[PDB]
Amino acid sequence: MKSRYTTEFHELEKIGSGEFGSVFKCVKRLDGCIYAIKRSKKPLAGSVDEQNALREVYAHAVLGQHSHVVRYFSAWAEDDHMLIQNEYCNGGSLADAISENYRIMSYFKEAELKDLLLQVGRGLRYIHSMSLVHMDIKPSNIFISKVMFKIGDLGHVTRISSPQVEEGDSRFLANEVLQENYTHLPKADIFALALTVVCAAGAEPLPRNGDQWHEIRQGRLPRIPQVLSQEFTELLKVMIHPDPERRPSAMALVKHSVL
Numbered sequence: 605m606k607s608r609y610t611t612e613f614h615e616l617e618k619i620g621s622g623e624f625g626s627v628f629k630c631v632k633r634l635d636g637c638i639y640a641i642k643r644s645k646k647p648l649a650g651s652v653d654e655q656n657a658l659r660e661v662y663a664h665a666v667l668g669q670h671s672h673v674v675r676y677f678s679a680w681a682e683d684d685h686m687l688i689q690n691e692y693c694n695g696g697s698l699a700d701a702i703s704e705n706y707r708i709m710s711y712f713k714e715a716e717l718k719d720l721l722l723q724v725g726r727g728l729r730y731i732h733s734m735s736l737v738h739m740d741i742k743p744s745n746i747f748i749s750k751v752m753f754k755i756g757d758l759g760h761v762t763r764i765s766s767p768q769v770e771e772g773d774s775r776f777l778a779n780e781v782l783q784e785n786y787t788h789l790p791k792a793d794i795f796a797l798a799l800t801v802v803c804a805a806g807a808e809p810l811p812r813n814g815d816q817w818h819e820i821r822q823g824r825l826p827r828i829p830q831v832l833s834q835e836f837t838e839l840l841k842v843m844i845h846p847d848p849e850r851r852p853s854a855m856a857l858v859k860h861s862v863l
């Protein structure tokens with residue numbers, strides 16, 4: 605053996621795990637810097653799963669110049685593994701910040717929600733300008749590094765006009781995508797970003813299915829435990845409109861008067 609991973613990096617700790625492998629905080633020996641490295645089992649060459657694994661790499665290889673998307677450094681294969689070395693964000697995930705806030709009953713305030721929405725919105729405007737869509741926006745895929753929010757986990761990225769898509773987290777999924785209608789994919793990322801902001805505003809954990817799931821898809825915002833300006837609430841509402849054409853594009857969101 606004597607892995608590139610082992611020889612080039614000192615592994616500090618495990619920071620994420622899934623049915624997609626694990627992510628480790630590592631120090632690169634030569635440059636002294638800390639990176640996040642995802643190490644996953646290598647798919648059978650030529651398989652659909654390998655195509656999917658490589659999309660992640662290809663998406664990272666083209667989305668590496670934006671301040672609101674986690675930067676990519678390198679990727680390689682060794683052993684029975686594929687590895688991707690990305691920028692490390694020392695503030696943890698948005699999900700973890702929201703979970704801590706939940707317990708302490710002190711949520712993101714309106715100014716902070718607007719900042720989150722604008723920052724990730726800029727990240728989305730960049731991804732969408734590249735004719736790509738993220739397809740899995742949610743708090744556990746947004747990382748924190750003035751606070752800076754960055755979109756990570758490009759494992760569901762695909763081209764905007766793709767006839768096949770892999771569905772992102774059910775809790776943030778727009779109905780049209782579930783219905784296999786891929787005519788306005790970028791608006792699916794907008795819908796998930798609004799629900800992401802709702803979670804940051806202190807809402808109860810989102811439904812995975814059932815009656816409350818359908819209600820949100822009818823364009824009804826979940827209850828938020830704080831008073832928000834009507835103008836801001838209306839923007840979140842239009843972002844989950846049942847008609848994807850009514851939702852703002854990422855460009856329109858970033859230029860929105862409310863922000």
Ligand SMILES: O=C1NC(=O)c2c1c(-c1ccccc1)cc1[nH]c3ccc(O)cc3c21
Pocket residue numbers: 619620627640641642674688690691692693694695696697747756757758
């Ligand atoms: O790319 C990343 N940059 C990161 O800083 C990072 C990343 C990932 C990640 C890496 C590849 C695929 C999907 C997620 C998971 C992650 N979980 C984390 C938990 C804590 C943290 O401070 C950072 C990360 C983290």
Ligand SMILES: [Mg+2]
Pocket residue numbers: 744745757
């Ligand atoms: Mg993830």
Ligand SMILES: [Mg+2]
Pocket residue numbers: 655656657658659660758759760761
């Ligand atoms: Mg993929």
